[PDB]
């Protein structure tokens, strides 16, 4: 009952420094989110065990 | 006695200008220092002569 659905997927992007900066620069990026189906099927707890 | 010590060699740098800008940029750029080995072998003279 768990899904991922990704609109972009992760990759990494280089050389996003400013103009005429000496120095280095790089990110990674994405865009994706979560989908649950059925949460009666599903529990959560909290405290110990 | 007279000696260059190098970390980054002098080179051009080409395509620094602001994005868009109908114009084209370029710098020198370069690191470096000097190193002097026996001073007593060396002189320096002010004045006329």
């Not at 280095?24 to 909290?46: D, R």
Request: glycine share 14%; no cysteine; aromatic share 6%.
């Amino acid at each position: 009952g768990i899904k991922e659905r990704v609109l972009r997927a992760t990759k990494p992007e280089n050389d996003i420094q400013q103009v005429g900066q000496d120095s280095i620069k790089g990110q990674w990026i994405g865009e994706f989110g979560l989908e649950v189906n059925h949460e009666e099927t599903m529990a959560f707890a909290g405290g110990i065990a």
